[PDB]
Amino acid sequence: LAHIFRGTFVHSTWTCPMEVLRDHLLGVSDSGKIVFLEEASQQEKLAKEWCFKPCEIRELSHHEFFMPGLVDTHIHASQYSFAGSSIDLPLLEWLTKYTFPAEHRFQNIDFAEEVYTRVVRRTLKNGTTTACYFATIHTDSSLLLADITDKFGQRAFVGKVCMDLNDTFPEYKETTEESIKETERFVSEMLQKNYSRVKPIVTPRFSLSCSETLMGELGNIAKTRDLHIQSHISENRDEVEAVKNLYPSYKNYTSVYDKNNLLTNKTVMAHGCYLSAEELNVFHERGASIAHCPNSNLSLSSGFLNVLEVLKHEVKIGLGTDVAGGYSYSMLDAIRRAVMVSNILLINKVNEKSLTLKEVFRLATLGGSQALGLDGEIGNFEVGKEFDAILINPKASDSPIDLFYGDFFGDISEAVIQKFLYLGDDRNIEEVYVGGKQVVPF
Amino acid sequence: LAHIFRGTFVHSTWTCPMEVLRDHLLGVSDSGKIVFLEEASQQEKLAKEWCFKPCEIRELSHHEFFMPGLVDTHIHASQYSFAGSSIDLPLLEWLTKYTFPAEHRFQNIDFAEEVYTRVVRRTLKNGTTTACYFATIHTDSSLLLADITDKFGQRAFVGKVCMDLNDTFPEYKETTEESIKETERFVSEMLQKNYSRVKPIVTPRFSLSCSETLMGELGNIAKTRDLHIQSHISENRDEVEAVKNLYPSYKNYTSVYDKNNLLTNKTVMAHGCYLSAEELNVFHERGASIAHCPNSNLSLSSGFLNVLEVLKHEVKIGLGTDVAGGYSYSMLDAIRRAVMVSNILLINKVNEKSLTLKEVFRLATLGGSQALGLDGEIGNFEVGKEFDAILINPKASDSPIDLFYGDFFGDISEAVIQKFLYLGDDRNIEEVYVGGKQVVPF
Ligand SMILES: CC(C)[C@H](N)C(=O)OCCOCn1cnc2c(=O)[nH]c(N)nc21
Ligand SMILES: CC(C)[C@H](N)C(=O)OCCOCn1cnc2c(=O)[nH]c(N)nc21
Ligand SMILES: [Zn+2]
Ligand SMILES: [Zn+2]
């Protein structure tokens, strides 16, 4: 056994949005798997079965708790250099003014190295143990990202972006053939590295930047290598209308992807704000997933995803930060913003209720893992799963949270857990484990 | 002279939402006033006029800047103990379930001391140099808050809350006569202490907790002592309708206050989400102000204040955190949420545009100071004003912000300033000055 921990564990299950396991014992194997999880009353029994001494057990402080690692289902690693600025002009203006020039710089491998090192370190330290990254159109810089994530021990999908259409910034695109060849090369080189927890993902940027021909070939590569696919869908009203006019023969945005083999049981689509009920039924039937990106949706004045309607349709859904469209790199920010979007829908009388903080906590961990096809391996504390987890200390040095005796003995349930979700930050994250290995501190 | 600083200063003016003054020299007197502000080319001249040596000048790091202190126009100091929890059930449910029991504990002076010490230290360290506090109905605990704020050197209005109606938690109220006598005592004792920058403010909680009789007498006390008034107005639809049914003889919520001498040129009202155009004209004509509390308005599913409409009506407006209805104690959070509310109005097509980050920055500093009647003394860097300011270091130890060479030499304007406003936190606030005195570090 690599670790045995005693203390409080907080996670989600499909039948319980937030389950708090107090004074429990958890064991993690050498291979990084959770091998037991039981009440501490079972110490003697476990110590015999698993051959360990009581002195080998790490006891958490009385006010600390473990929770599962946060899962970021959509982030543009390549836009991190300007995250927290701009976020004003509209989205085609924006893409042209900020985004495409920033991504064009990734033709320089040394620039790539600086930005990607910073983004992987920053998200890990904020407790993002699994990330689904968009990189750039450049195969070699996108391979460097994969190598960086492996070095740091973060779990990740890395996607070389494809685009053969780009009218507003023509310096930043590939020919159709180039896009196909470079994707084939990216995937082969990724498979050659054989990284234990970093895999390639097929990434048409979106339907407006990829021809039918390209889309269809990317779909074939995904099928033949059995890979995940990631793209954007129905993020704003102008995009919805642009697609309608560039692809008039398709019934809706969803059909454009579906008929081109881009909507599979291993597909995740960012945004989804303007998907209709009919389109959600198609997501459900195909096993495709949505990455809810609430900060970006408000920051860029895009729209509101109706998460309650998505859940009613039994569509798989996780949370994403959508850096740099969303200005925050934090999944704690994404959780807060998700609660707020659901409240917006209640205020506007679209829905009759809002999402609870606990339901959103489940989206950020188990929901996200399900959205990326990883919920057999991660997302909560179940025997069999990889130990992807973060040790939270609400009383850490310089903590942004003020705890009072009432938070432990008063009349508000999960008071401390809720204050961490609403007020905490990286100062409260003392340790981060991915695959049972301690990755933070670095 | 107490200080002379050389470097970058960022502030608002009425004609410019964000003015960046690079390599400037600023002098602060012994009395805490700004005595000069000029380009550093004037060093020799100023050194002679004001009798100081070049070695006496404090040079800011090349990546640091001063900005004015943040002004929190509305916060319930007494609810800080449960901030970051709860925030789920509706507002009368909430008031009954969480708020009134928490405020009832302030009958214990030792409890008051702990909560109020923590809140004043926390807001100061987050750069809130001026705060307009609601305390509790207890005169002695509310006087302790005033004393605490004085000890720490924060500028503040402190308001003993009045309520003689409380059907849902009758243990927490005063009789009408008691309310009047205790307000008179609070004000007298505040004036006896003679604090240099902490003043009393008359505080009927809101029309639903104060009888006509009470409201009218509070209005007389304000008039006769020439005091500010603070209350809540038109925060949610149910409140609007409750007022209509408890005060059927008044034309609208605004009239209830106005006809009872509670709407004056020294009045600030929190929320205002459901004020009509006619009511805003009355605010404008009386000189009364609004405290925009966007985090609380979304957190409690209340509504959206249309800030563009408020500005179009030339109504005075600042920002507030509304702890604990809003879960964050940070004015940086309030700035971010304000931008987001204006974007909500653009997405819903109520407005044709949103507020810029710069306009919201102006609300958080100069707008707020104007809302509290203090814009002759604070809110920006102008000769004559008190030096209320915060030194920002975006590269501080453990900074949440990653700076890149491009933020200083690229094509995005005020990149660094914007990253601090969107991503910064208390780690970026190195020093806080109120009245020219350094109050942080403590
Ligand atoms: C007129 C329309 C075509 C509209 N202005 C438009 O082009 O929408 C673009 C955004 O669609 C998805 N998308 C593609 N790349 C990105 C991207 O990099 N970030 C985000 N948030 N969305 C993206
Ligand atoms: C049915 C209605 C009367 C409705 N449920 C209601 O009572 O609204 C109450 C909120 O009005 C203003 N208010 C009074 N005290 C507070 C308070 O402590 N926090 C906030 N955010 N608002 C407050
Ligand atoms: Zn995106
Ligand atoms: Zn309030």
Author numbering:
A (entry chain A), B (entry chain A): 9 to 450
Task: Give the authors' words.
In the present study we have addressed the possible cross-reactivity of NAs with enzymes of human nucleotide metabolism using an in vitro approach. We have designed a nucleoside analog library (NAL) containing 45 FDA (U.S. Food and Drug Administration)-approved nucleoside drugs. This library was screened against 23 selected enzymes in human nucleotide metabolism using a light scattering-based TSA. Thermal shift assay (TSA) was used, where binding is detected by the thermal stabilization of proteins due to interaction with the ligand. However, unexpected stabilizing ligands were identified for two proteins: guanine deaminase (GDA) and uridine phosphorylase 1 (UPP1), which were further analyzed by using biochemical and structural means.
Interactions were detected between GDA and valaciclovir, aciclovir, penciclovir, ganciclovir, thioguanine and mercaptopurine. UPP1 and GDA bind nucleoside and nucleobase, respectively. This is probably one reason why we were able to identify interactions with these two enzymes, since our NAL consists of both nucleosides and nucleobase analogs. Few cross reactivities were observed between the 23 enzymes investigated within the nucleotide pathway and the 45 FDA-approved NAs.
